[PDB]
Amino acid sequence: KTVPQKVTIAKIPRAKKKYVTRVCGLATFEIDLKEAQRFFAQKFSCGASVTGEDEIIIQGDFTDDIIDVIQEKWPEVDDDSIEDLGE
């Protein structure tokens, strides 16, 4: 319906690695993005930023393993509810 009248601002870091991994939709599971950002940063020892309403950016390509990491950390994310958009 009507899109909310609302302004958001976010700083987004320059990518220093060959890739960045963008994670969207954790908030639709009521996962707190600050908690998620902390987990990813500590888990991977790479930079992680909250960059959108429902969006986290991780420095590095973690697409081969991040689905299993997310599902282990937040097991409410069932197999039918998470996917790599590059595949």
Query: Which residues have a Cβ under 8 Å from the Cβ of 8 and sit 6 or more positions away?
Result: 52, 53
Q: Compute the least distance from the CB of residue 68 to Mg ion, in Å.
A: 4
- Which residue, 10 or 81, has its beta carbon nearer to Mg ion? 81
- Point out the residue whose Cβ comes nearest to Mg ion: 63
Segment (H or E) for 22 = strand 20-24
The residues that touch Mg ion, with contacts defined as CB under 5 A, are 63-65, 68, 71
State the angle between helix axes of 33-44 and 66-73 in degrees (0 to 180), rounded to the nearest 10. 120
- Which residue, 2 or 64, has its beta carbon nearer to Mg ion? 64
For 25, the token pair is: 């939709």
- Which residue, 30 or 87, has its beta carbon nearer to Mg ion? 87
Q: Compute the least distance from the CB of residue 35 to Mg ion, in Å.
A: 20
Q: Compute the least distance from the CB of residue 85 to Mg ion, in Å.
A: 6
Asked whether 83 and 37 are in contact (CB, 8 A), the reply is no
